[PDB]
Amino acid sequence: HMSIITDVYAREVLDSRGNPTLEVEVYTESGAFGRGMVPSGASTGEHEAVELRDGDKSRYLGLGTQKAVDNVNNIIAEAIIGYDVRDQQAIDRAMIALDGTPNKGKLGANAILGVSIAVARAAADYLEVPLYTYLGGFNTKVLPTPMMNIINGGSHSDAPIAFQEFMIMPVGAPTFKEGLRWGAEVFHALKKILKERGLVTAVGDEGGFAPKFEGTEDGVETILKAIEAAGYEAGENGIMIGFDCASSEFYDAERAVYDYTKFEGEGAAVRTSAEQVDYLEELVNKYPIITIEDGMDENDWDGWKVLTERLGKRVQLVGDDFFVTNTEYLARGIKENAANSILIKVNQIGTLTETFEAIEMAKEAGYTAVVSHRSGETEDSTIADIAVATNAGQIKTGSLSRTDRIAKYNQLLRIEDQLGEVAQYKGIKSFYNLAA
Amino acid sequence: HMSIITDVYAREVLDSRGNPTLEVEVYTESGAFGRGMVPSGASTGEHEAVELRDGDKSRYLGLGTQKAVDNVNNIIAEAIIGYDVRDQQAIDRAMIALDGTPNKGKLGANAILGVSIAVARAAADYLEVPLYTYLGGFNTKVLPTPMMNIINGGSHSDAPIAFQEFMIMPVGAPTFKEGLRWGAEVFHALKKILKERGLVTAVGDEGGFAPKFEGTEDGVETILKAIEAAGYEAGENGIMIGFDCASSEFYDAERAVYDYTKFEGEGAAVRTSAEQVDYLEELVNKYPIITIEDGMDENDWDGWKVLTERLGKRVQLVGDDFFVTNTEYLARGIKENAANSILIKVNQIGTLTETFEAIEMAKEAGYTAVVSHRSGETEDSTIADIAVATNAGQIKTGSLSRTDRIAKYNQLLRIEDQLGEVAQYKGIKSFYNLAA
Amino acid sequence: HMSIITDVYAREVLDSRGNPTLEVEVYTESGAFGRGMVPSGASTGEHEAVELRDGDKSRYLGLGTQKAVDNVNNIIAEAIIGYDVRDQQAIDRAMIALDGTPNKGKLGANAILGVSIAVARAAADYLEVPLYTYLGGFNTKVLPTPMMNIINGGSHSDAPIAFQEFMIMPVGAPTFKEGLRWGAEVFHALKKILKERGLVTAVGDEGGFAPKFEGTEDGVETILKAIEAAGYEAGENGIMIGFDCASSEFYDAERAVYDYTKFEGEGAAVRTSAEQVDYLEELVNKYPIITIEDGMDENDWDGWKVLTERLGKRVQLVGDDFFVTNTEYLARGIKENAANSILIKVNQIGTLTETFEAIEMAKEAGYTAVVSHRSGETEDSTIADIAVATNAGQIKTGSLSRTDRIAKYNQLLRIEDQLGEVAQYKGIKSFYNLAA
Amino acid sequence: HMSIITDVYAREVLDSRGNPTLEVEVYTESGAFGRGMVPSGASTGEHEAVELRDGDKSRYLGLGTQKAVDNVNNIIAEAIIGYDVRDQQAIDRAMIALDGTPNKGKLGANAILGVSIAVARAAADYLEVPLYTYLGGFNTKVLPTPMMNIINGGSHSDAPIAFQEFMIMPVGAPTFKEGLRWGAEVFHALKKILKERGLVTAVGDEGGFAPKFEGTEDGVETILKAIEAAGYEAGENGIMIGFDCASSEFYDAERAVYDYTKFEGEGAAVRTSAEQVDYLEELVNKYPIITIEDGMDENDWDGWKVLTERLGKRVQLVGDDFFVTNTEYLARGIKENAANSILIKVNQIGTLTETFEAIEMAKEAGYTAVVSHRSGETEDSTIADIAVATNAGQIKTGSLSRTDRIAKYNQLLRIEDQLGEVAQYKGIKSFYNLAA
């Protein structure tokens, strides 16, 4: 009986930003093993799975996770011992039934996810195969195109800019190894230009800068200056820009209006939904933009319909906080024509079995699906293997600065060395949701 | 060095219908073993992958396969010995480069497919896992809806009926084991109705009847009397009908017209491409039709555009000889919006790697893909693994009579038993390309 | 304890013709395994072993086999676990004693046979030897001469012919690989001659044609036309004809006479037992015939004595429905001089232990023994290994058309490749029961 | 021959801050595996061990590491293949001889350190034991006291403060798990105090803040308000402060004076070496200071004698750029009585053998030794094993923010859990060089 799960064990550790999180470890009878640990983040009263936190105001200001360590050791390990390590779907279905709630309130999504990743790593170690081959079978080959954060704004800095972050994509590169170099050389050309102007070059929670720019037009024109000073083109032969909003944050839920005078001054505009579509069309007609994210409110389905009619032929319109990784809303989004892409976060839904079902339901509609980080990342690297295992073609893994971010880029350089001449980089041909 | 391929060896054997085919065996240094053998077919006048056959007029009327087994033993074997059995994509790309011709005509597509199936079955045996889990990774679980042929016509009979075969689908069934039972219990009621009328009940190459009916309306109304007599009901709540209209056999390109006087009597109607879409629309309004295959000629691109615009929300429009399992033609079909599904034949393309690439491209475009039999079949059951490894949701495998056909329905009964409570049968929900 | 039987398991599957049958499976403690599944057929009130069938008029018209799956899983498997996989004779003796009835009525012959074949395949896999070597020891080498069905009559077609089927035997061939080619080329010369005449070329349950021939004289003379048109000789240097009757079907049990006016018209003859022997002698003196089967009634022992005195020097007189694979009647047949050969069917008697005892009791009397198919065959191949394991020299495995038949011919081509220069084909010297 | 090294292989990858570094992998004949990758740095104008970098101005601004990975693959690999994986000291002495240059400048110290770490991690995996037990033998048990950076100054900020960084030590804590908690709970109270004052709270390369304070007294009094606000107390009964005075950045050797007007305003004082020891003495009397690093210039030997005479019983005087991890200079520092501690940097010297020799010499002289990070770090955690393998009792690993820093604090939480009741945390008892 060499493949049986012999025991399961959990402990409390720290994430980037320095708050408590779990680590879980699994062993088989032959002595093969796997470690899984969870990135941090939660919500309550929303349509999302719940973290369990201790609430002790005397330890870590209430953010401790001993209450979730007791569930793994006293309850989940008692039920899971004696299964075969390769029965992934029967194990995940057994935990979801053991909990017995829709929000995962009793066991918490942090306990259930940490186990689910540990079992997959033990099984790939036992068979002696790479984790992208265990997850995806023999037909895995496409290296994702990265979208790289460089400047922040909105609620994440004191600068007079409304949108939450700006990105670059190296869509013209020949291979992932040259595509990563082009992003590094542009980051080391932008740092000099902020230093010359006498602005702040200290980094935020994703490794991008947060300098006091005088407005969105100078925020974008300075990025076009860094791209040229590094020596590369802008447009579909070179590098392209993207945006990421949080249109939830300035939508007035009583006046039904986009009041920009929250993050910009009293001199800023106030816009109804048809005028917000006109403002995004003015930007897309002016700059080398290829993607926009959460440009409309979480509950304003009428805006999402009008926006997708106007721009959905030319640009990737991602929904994130609109769908919350949930198949009960991706179904209605496909039915009512509400977007042309989705953003996937494994800890919003809380198992590998429920994750891989949403990725394929998106693909069969023609929607591109993108895997992504949380704020409190760890030294774990699994989302780079999910991106190559599903041939998904795009990844959102943060800026070129901190090891909590650089650990994923260094993993994709190991995979592209293993695959040899089988590996493919699609560049601009990865946007299959546009003009097909 | 336990995983290494240590020899590969080939021999000549008979298929059903009693013509020469080919069989290959592969062994590793551990002593793990896999066998694969090729289904029989070629088509003359277009660039499918090409079989190699012997020249001598004497043996087997010139259908012998000695040159193909000489190529596996004398050319492919010395090249593939020394690879790891798990290098599927590097082995497939090595044979294609060794041959070096677009239609595979120098070594023959019968040699290259035989080797490619043997290696995949040696590797899944070496790891001790099912072939669907080896090909598909941890997330395989949907049992396909079957299309069951039950009547022939057209060129395959001396009856005056224009279309080549007629089918049933058990779309309303709870589970694959009940869907297979309903198919058998209708077939045993139709056989009784033909004996009462005094028509013949012997069977053709596909295991279905070919009786001398008066016309296509008497064919379809005879099927509805069998569905009523076995105890079920027609439409999406029970059983649905479908057609294979092999429409290239009765198009005339010197007058540019669909001429029924090739198979119908001298009173028969003659239809230009507008009158042909009007005819299929007239049938779909009168009977419970769900799928129409190949309804317009191979090169009638304007006909395919017009047909798909008229019918495409109601009915599945499968293309067969229109695309010939080729990504060069499936690209144009997507771009032009010419059809809403594809049918896959593994030996038209000639490797397992290129087969899984074509399924993925169709799926991203929002098409279904249907995996299928040939006429000359063997005791092999590999397509029942490919239909589950890709979660494709549909299969065409023939009527309920002969073990060239039944061996696939019996392999799906083993897979549905290994999966237990984790298996799914979608039924009418399998048509994700419809009902938008 | 590596060779112990660890567990036994059974499921319901379909046969050729599409009715339910069992499959049974066995594993040892080292993980060697074997699968066995049963061909269909039964009788009641006759001197033959009984199948168990569910009798549910609401499932498969009463032909279901769940009642026999419960016996394998709840009773037979409980008794057999913990035996050594190699104790075949002790295992078969234990099941026969556990049942406790002469007709095998309580457990059913389908449950008991399926187990018995599974254990033999597990044991040959554990030792790592071919199944003919496990069954027969080191002295196995003679490839059987095949008798191949081509035309059918009697109860099996509407044509005016009394005898149930006609056969060809390639007795002049140098090797089994040339002996199979000569049969294939004559089948593909006969198919053209039926199209030329405008007769039906659709196949029946054994892969032979059933066309409306005008009488037995044209049925045999057309076969002599196909043999010449393929280019070969008729007689002991080439190909020879055989017949198979069912003289049970037209023997009048009250008038004590063979009334041919059942299947032939009102103008046919009516013959008493000495006149039937005269009629068979007129056929044998006219055509190149070498074998006849069931030419007299099942109970007309006086007819069988007279017939064997008249013709038993020149022709092989097979008893089939006369002996019913039963040693209590083969004893009386040897005592009273009643035939010169026997037909063997493993599912009439119902174990491998009771099968191999009757084959040797026949051989020691100078009778030839022949192994054969049922109507509802499966993708199983075991009867080809029984034929080479007993050096029996003859096989009755059906026509050159369906995979339920071609699977046995393709297995004998694998055995003759394994045996190399040790293999022998006896041709006409295999009839040791004539002129010795 | 199971223990033998069978290949070694190297590749290029990014560090944190996003510059090129190097990674090495080693395999044995048993298939045991070890990976090691190098932290980034060099210093210009003195004989540390030397890195090798590429010449091309274009790629990565000339910081590429292709020549270093060519040397591992083409020169070191053919020499180290065939050794036993446990011959650590013979392997280390072979690379040093093969290079043959005092500063390691022909192969580069980046190549030689990568191979030396990979080999030690393959050997601890082959024996199946923890790395601290492999390096240290059976008597490893002391968890080190951490030095936690929390504010920057000097060259690393645009604030007018002279010293380069400020720290806290949790000297009064019961256990390492409480000592790590007190560090994080002060950091989250300082972050709130900076937001109230309106100063920036983005982070530098070491994960600590760099706010625009008025002067060094406002820095130290801001830290004391955080220690009071989190709930603890200052001095040996709770938390203590320490400095890194990078005093070589503001010494002038053409006037022979410590000139504060390099970083302080034009009103700043100018101090000769006697006035500089009087300044440090004035700080140590006013606040709870325990450690002073690098307080006099690299060549101010008379300053170091006078400083160590004045302060050496009260305070730890760490030397960093004074000794450069070199036994030729540490010998003179001992003999001439110049300082009372050393700080160890593994890539200043270039092997694990020479690193353990320098720790031993310091320990016998009655000095402490402190193991330390560089600025360009990686996901590796090896220094958390070297601090326990030598029972050293102190470590400098950075602030509580980024996983280039947190990955070491998380590894010491695993080690403290494996040891159980056998582990010790010394706290204020760790300063064995003081309180004589």
Which residues fall within 8 angstroms of residue D198, CB to CB, at 6 or more apart? none
Q: Which residues contact A101 (CB under 8 A, 6 or more apart)?
A: none
Q: Where are the beta strands (DSSP E) in A106-259?
A: 142-143, 145-146, 148-152, 165-169, 240-244, 251-252, 257-259
- Cβ of residue D93 closer than 8 Å to a chain A Cβ: no
Q: Which residue is associated with the tokens 């393929």?
A: C230
Residue of chain A nearest D61, judged by CA positions: A185
Query: Strand B394-396 to strand B145-152: parallel, antiparallel, or no bridges (unpaired)?
Result: parallel
Whether residue D212 sits in one domain with residue D120: no
Radius of gyration of chain B (CA): 22
Is the separation of the CB atoms in D291 and D315 below 8 Å? Answer: yes
CA distance D385 to D136: 9
Q: What is the number of alpha carbons within 13 Å of residue C382 lying toward its C-beta?
A: 24
Token code pair at residue C241: 């004809």
Kindly state whether D200 is in contact with chain A, defined as any CB-CB distance less than 8 angstroms: yes
Q: How many CB pairs under 8 A join B and C?
A: 91
Tell me the longest C-alpha to C-alpha distance in chain A. 72
The single residue of B345, B354, B377, B416 carrying the catalytic annotation is: B345
Q: Tokens at residue C180, please?
A: 């199979």
Tell if the CB–CB gap between B60 and C203 is shorter than 8 Å. no
Give C-chain residues touching B17 at CB under 8 angstroms. 401
Q: Show which subunits contact A, needing at least 3 CB pairs below 8 angstroms.
A: B, D
User: Alpha-carbon distance B15 to B18, whole Å?
Assistant: 5
Closest CA to C11 of C117, C85, C119, C114: C114
Q: Which positions of A make up the binding site?
A: 156, 165, 244, 293, 320, 345, 372-375, 396
Contact B353 A135 (CB under 8 A): no
C409–B404 C-beta distance less than 8 A:
no
Binding residues of A for Mg(2+): 244, 293, 320
Instruction: Say whether A60 and D407 touch across the interface (CB within 8 A).
Output: no
Q: Determine the Cα–Cα distance for residues D374 and A421; give it in Å rounded to an integer.
A: 36
Domain containing B265 equals 129-436
How far apart CA B61 and CA C194 sit, in angstroms, is 18
Sign (positive or negative) of CA dihedral C302, C306, C309, C315: negative
What distance in Å separates residue A389's CA from the closest CA in chain B? 9
Residue type, C295: G
Q: Which among C108, C128, C148 is the end of a domain?
A: C128
**By three-state DSSP, how is residue C358 classified?**
helix
Going by C-alpha positions, the residue among C247, C271, C249 that lies closest to residue C259 is C271
Do A335 and A417 reside in the same domain of the chain?
yes
Q: Are residues B234 and B109 in the same domain?
A: no
Please name the residues between 367 and 426 in chain D that touch chain A, using a CB distance below 8 Å. Answer: 377-379, 400-404, 406-407, 409-410, 413-414, 417
Q: Phi/psi at D257 (nearest 5 deg)?
A: -145, 145
> Are residues C420 and C338 both part of a single domain?
yes
Q: What is the DSSP letter of D372?
A: E
> Which contiguous run of DSSP H or E holds residue C110?
helix C109-127
Distance CA C117, CA C356 (A): 13
Whether the CB of A366 is below 8 Å from some CB of chain B: the reply is yes
Measured CA to CA, the distance from residue C32 to residue C85 in angstroms comes to 10
Question: Out of B203, B379, B413, whose CB is closest to C203?
Answer: B203
Q: How far apart are CA D124 and CA B205, in angstroms?
A: 65
Measured distance CA(B150)–CA(B399) in Å, rounded: 6
Give the number of A-B residue pairs with CB atoms closer than 8 Å. Answer: 66
d(CA C435, CA B57): 40
| Nearest residue to C410 (alpha-carbon basis) of C430, C432, C436, C380 | C380
DSSP per-residue string spanning A343-389: EE-HHHH-SHHHHHHHHHHHHTTT-EEEEE--SB--S--HHHHHHHH
Residues C261 and C220 grouped into a single domain: yes
Tell me if C371 sits within 8 A of C383, measured CB to CB. yes
Give the C-alpha distances (Å, rounded to integers) separating D85 from D4, D94, D129: 6, 14, 14
Q: What is the per-residue DSSP string for D95-115?
A: HHHHH--TT-TTT-HHHHHHH
List CB contacts (< 8 A) between B409 and chain C: 14
Contact A181 D60 (CB under 8 A): yes
Contacts with B11 from chain C: Cβ below 8 Å = 413-414, 417
Q: How far is residue A196's CA from residue B231's CA, in Å, rounded to a whole number?
A: 84
Number of neighbouring beta carbons within 10 Å of residue B191: 13
Quick one: tokens of D210? 């760099």
Residue A353 neighbours by CB distance under 10 Å: 21
Q: Is D408 a catalytic residue?
A: no
Annotated catalytic residue, options C206, C298, C377, C416: C206
Query: How far is D153 from D250, CA to CA, in rounded Å?
Result: 13
Q: Do C203 and B200 touch (CB under 8 A)?
A: no
Please tell me if residue B135 touches chain A, with a CB cutoff of 8 Å.
Answer: yes
Cβ contact D25:D69 at 8 Å: no
CB D318 within 8 A of CB D294: yes
Chain C contact for B309 (CB, 8 A cutoff): no
- Of A68, A96, A128, the residue that ends a domain is A128
Q: Is D397 helix (H, G, I), strand (E, B) or coil?
A: coil
Q: Using DSSP, state whether D312 is helix, strand or coil.
A: coil
**Shared-domain flag, residues C219 and C286:** yes
Q: Which residues of chain B from 327 to 346 reach within 8 Å of chain C, CB to CB?
A: none
* Yes or no, beta carbons of C14 and B400 under 8 Å apart: yes
Q: Is A46 designated active site?
A: no
Residues of A in contact with D180 (CB under 8 A): 14
Question: Which residues contact residue C43 at a Cβ distance below 8 angstroms, ignoring those fewer than 6 apart?
Answer: none
Token duo for residue C5: 């039987």
Quick one: C429 and C288 in the same domain?
A: yes
Residues C302 and C344 grouped into a single domain: yes
Give the residue before each break in chain C, using a C-to-N cut-off of over 2.5 angstroms; say none if it is continuous: none
**In this complex, is the C-beta atom of A234 within 8 Å of any C-beta atom belonging to chain D?**
no
Closest CA to B79 of B92, B67, B66, B68: B92
Which residues are paired to C240 by β-bridges? C169
Best CA proximity match to A11, nearest among A83, A64, A86, A84? A64
Alpha carbon separation from C29 to A87, C4, C26, C83 (Å, rounded): 22, 6, 10, 11
**Cβ B398 vs Cβ B410: under 8 Å:** no
Distances (CA, A) of B141 to A212, B144, B390, B416: 53, 10, 9, 9
- Adjacency order of strands within the sheet including A251-252: A251-252, A257-259, A270-271
Nearest by Cα to C406 from B375, B40, B20, B150 = B20
Sign of the Cα pseudo-torsion (B204, B207, B208, B211, in order) = positive
Query: Do chain D and chain A touch with ≥3 beta carbon pairs under 8 Å?
Result: yes
The SS3 assignment for D430 reads helix
C338 phi/psi in degrees, rounded to 5: -95, -15
Shared domain for A324 and A410, answered yes or no, is yes
- Whole-number Å distance between alpha carbons of C379 and C37: 9
Query: Residues D328, D329, D330, CA angle at the centre, nearest 5°?
Result: 100
Q: Three-state SS for C328?
A: helix
Residue type, D334: I
Q: How many residues are listed for chain D in this entry? A: 436
Q: Which residue of B has its CA nearest to A131?
A: B137
Tell me the CA distances in angstroms from C22 to A97, C10, C25, C67, one per residue in order. 35, 7, 10, 11
Q: Looking at beta carbons, which residues of chain B come within 8 Å of A390?
A: none
Q: Quick one: how far is CA D392 from the chain centroid?
A: 13
8 Å CB contact of A184 and D403:
no
Token digits of residue C101: 């009835």
Q: Which residues, 6 or more positions from C288, have their beta carbon under 8 angstroms from its beta carbon?
A: C234, C235, C240, C241
- All residues of chain A having their beta carbon less than 8 Å from the beta carbon of residue B127 are 127
Q: Which residues of A touch B432 (CB under 8 A)?
A: 364-365
Integer angstrom CA distances of residue C406 from A56, A133, C397, D326: 76, 39, 9, 83
Specify whether C146 is located in the same domain as C91: no
Asked if B302 and B427 sit in the same domain, the reply is yes
Residues D113/D78, Cβ–Cβ less than 8 Å: no
DSSP A288-335: -EEEEES-S-SS-HHHHHHHHHHHTTTSEEEESTTTTT-HHHHHHHHH
- Sign, Cα dihedral of D54, D58, D63, D69: negative
Phi-psi region of C407 (alpha: psi -120 to 50; beta: other; left: phi over 0): alpha
Task: Say if CB C167 and CB C241 are below 8 A apart.
Answer: yes
Transcribe A141-170 into DSSP letters. Answer: -EEPEE-EEEEE-GGGSSSS--SSEEEEE-
Nearest to C121 by CA among C381, C404, C411, C418: C381
Nearest neighbour of D18 by CB, restricted to A11, A61, A401: A401
Find out whether B161 and B193 touch, Cβ atoms under 8 Å: no
With helix as H, strand as E and coil as C, how does chain B read?
CCCEEEEEEEEEEECCCCCEEEEEEEEECCCCEEEEECCECCCCCCCCCCCCCCCCCCHHHHCCCHHHHHHHHHHHHHHHCCCECCCHHHHHHHHHHHHCCCCCCCCCHHHHHHHHHHHHHHHHHHCCCCHHHHHHCCCCCECCEEEEEEEECHHHCCCCCCCCEEEEECCCCCCHHHHHHHHHHHHHHHHHHHHHHCCCCCECCCCCECCCCCCHHHHHHHHHHHHHHCCCCECCCCEEEEEECCHHHCEECCCCEEEHHHCCCCCCCEECHHHHHHHHHHHHCCCCEEEEECCCCCCCHHHHHHHHHHHCCCCEEEECCCCCCCHHHHHHHHHHCCCCEEEECHHHHCCHHHHHHHHHHHHHCCCEEEEECCCECCCCCCHHHHHHHCCCCEEECCCCCCHHHHHHHHHHHHHHHHCHHHCECCHHHHCCCCCC
CB contact under 8 A, A436 and B334: yes
Lookup result for tokens 């968890």: D143
Give residue for tokens 């329905």: B409
**Residues with Cβ within 8 Å of residue B297, at least 6 apart in sequence:** B247, B248, B251, B253, B303
> Tokens standing for D41?
């740095």
Q: Single out the residue of D8, D34, D11, D9 nearest to residue D21, CA to CA.
A: D11
Side chain identity, residue C50: V
Residues C87-104 as b/e (b if ≥16 CB within 10 A, e otherwise) read bbeebbeebbeebeeebb
User: Order of strands, edge to edge, in the sheet holding B20-28?
Assistant: B5-14, B20-28, B33-37
Q: End of a domain among D95, D128, D161?
A: D128
One domain for residues B173 and B103: no
D204–A60 C-beta distance less than 8 A: no
Catalytic residue among C23, C48, C51, C345: C345
Q: Which two tokens stand for residue C29?
A: 């403690």
Tell me the residue type at C150: I
Q: How far is A255 from chain D (nearest CA, A)?
A: 32
Radius of gyration of chain A (CA): 22
Nearest Cβ partner for B138 among A88, A141, A422: A88
Query: Which of D351, D237, D249, D339 lies closest to D293, judged by CA?
Result: D339
- Nearest-10 crossing angle of helices B327-336, B352-364: 10
For residue A365, which residues of chain B lie inside 8 Å, CB to CB? 366, 432
Q: How many domains does chain D have?
A: 2
